[PDB]
């Protein structure tokens, strides 16, 4: 029996930028979700389509762990039915989402005096993302009537913008690490079970 490697997901030195959000599939293992949701490390632990207390009694085909960094004020956008730059252009959950959203303050890891500019988000997009879609393209965004032809200027914007993360920001502008666990059911044997 293998224990699910949630530790590797939650403890990675660096997290993905939200526009290029990282995904791991978790399979063929036993997961104790009580160890997770009974941790005081998390400032957000919200489950959708399941009661978190039955999770240790369920089996799924696979579990997915998507992870990335956003600012605190944006954590509310990681839920089904939300709107906003993050939910619309970076990471979208479906309305029938079955899974848990887990977030914690990462000011000590991801901010620096001077600003950590390595974490980015998509500011502009011609249409909303589909659920679980990822957009890693870097085309100049044509905000007005004139085609941009690769050149930046007014109404012609590079679509990705950097977070500013500094440790002295208020909590709304501090980095939060987010892990979204999705529970998948396919026409196949279950491979991830509670204890």
């Amino acid at each position: 029996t293998n224990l699910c490697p949630f530790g590797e997901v939650f403890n990675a030195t660096r997290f993905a930028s939200v526009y290029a959000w990282n995904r791991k599939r978790i399979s063929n293992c036993v997961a104790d979700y009580s160890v997770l949701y009974n941790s005081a490390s998390f400032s957000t632990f919200k489950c959708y389509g399941v009661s978190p207390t039955k999770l240790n009694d369920l089996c799924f085909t696979n579990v997915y762990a998507d992870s990335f960094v956003i600012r605190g004020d944006e954590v509310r956008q990681i839920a089904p039915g939300q709107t906003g730059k993050i939910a619309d252009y970076n990471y979208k959950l479906p309305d029938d989402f079955t899974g848990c959203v887990i977030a914690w303050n990462s000011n000590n890891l991801d901010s620096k005096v001077g600003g950590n500019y390595n974490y980015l988000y998509r500011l502009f997009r011609k249409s909303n993302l589909k659920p679980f879609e990822r957009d890693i393209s870097t085309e100049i965004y044509q905000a007005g009537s004139t085609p941009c032809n690769g050149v930046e200027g007014f109404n012609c914007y590079f679509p990705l913008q950097s977070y500013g993360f500094q440790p002295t920001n208020g909590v709304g502008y501090q980095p939060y690490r987010v892990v979204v666990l999705s529970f998948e059911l396919l026409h196949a044997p279950a491979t991830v079970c509670g204890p």
Partner: antibody
């Protein structure tokens, strides 16, 4: 290195079936979907379908629904495509290609392209 | 099923910029990302561009991709003779079951 190695050239009579194989190495076989694409002599690429080696689920192009079966054997990291009721214009090169997005959710699949290609298998259908 | 429309041929000289268009519909390019393949005579296609404008490792920077609305374009900025090849665009089409649609392909000749 990541690679897909296909089985050799096949010559079949009309109405027969053919089964072509595609062995994956250099990565974890179940992490990525596999696509099958064919190309008739002097013509363009034509998608045949995808298989998810993690579940065995498939999505066939409607033109081949009922005539093509894709399968896999994860113990030996190999995908198979069987085409039945062969016609002369099934004569073509058959590619398997790796879906380039790791860890798709099958019920929320997103196609971003195919990054690793087999060398191709010719199938010739003649009496 | 649907088709993606490419010109049957294109050409340019070395040092010139050549563009190849790819026209689709709201259910494929209008909804999904565009990827491009290069096929040299007698060999398997090779991924050139994905996610509208991303280059796989090993693809030189003179290849670029764009998308707007229901169409897309491949640019080769500074043709080299080894770029003589067939080029295909492709995209998911959400119609019915969902399926990959390929362009009809474009033969590029390099007049060098």
């Amino acid at each position: 290195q990541v690679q897909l190695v296909q089985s050799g050239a096949e010559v079949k009579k009309p109405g027969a079936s053919v089964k072509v194989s595609c062995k994956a190495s250099g990565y974890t076989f179940t992490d990525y979907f596999l696509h099958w694409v064919r190309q008739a002599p002097g013509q363009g690429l034509e998608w045949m379908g995808w298989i998810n080696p993690d579940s065995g689920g498939t999505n066939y192009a409607q033109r081949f629904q009922g005539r093509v079966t894709m399968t896999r054997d994860t113990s030996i990291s190999t995908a198979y495509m069987e085409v039945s009721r062969l016609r002369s214009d099934d004569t073509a090169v058959y590619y398997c290609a790796r879906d380039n997005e790791r860890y798709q959710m099958q019920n929320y699949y997103h196609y971003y392209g195919m990054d690793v290609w087999g060398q191709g298998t010719t199938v010739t259908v003649v009496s | 099923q649907s088709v993606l429309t490419q010109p049957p041929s294109a050409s340019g000289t070395p040092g010139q910029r050549v563009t190849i268009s790819c026209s689709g519909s709201s259910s494929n390019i209008g909804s999904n990302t565009v990827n491009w393949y290069q096929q040299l005579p007698g060999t398997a296609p090779k991924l050139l561009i994905y996610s509208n404008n991303q280059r796989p490792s090993g693809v030189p920077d003179r290849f670029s991709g764009s998308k707007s609305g229901t169409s897309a374009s491949l640019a080769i900025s500074g043709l080299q003779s080894e770029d003589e090849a067939d080029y295909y665009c492709a995209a998911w089409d959400d119609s019915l079951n969902g399926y990959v649609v390929f362009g009809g392909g474009t033969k590029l000749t390099v007049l060098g």
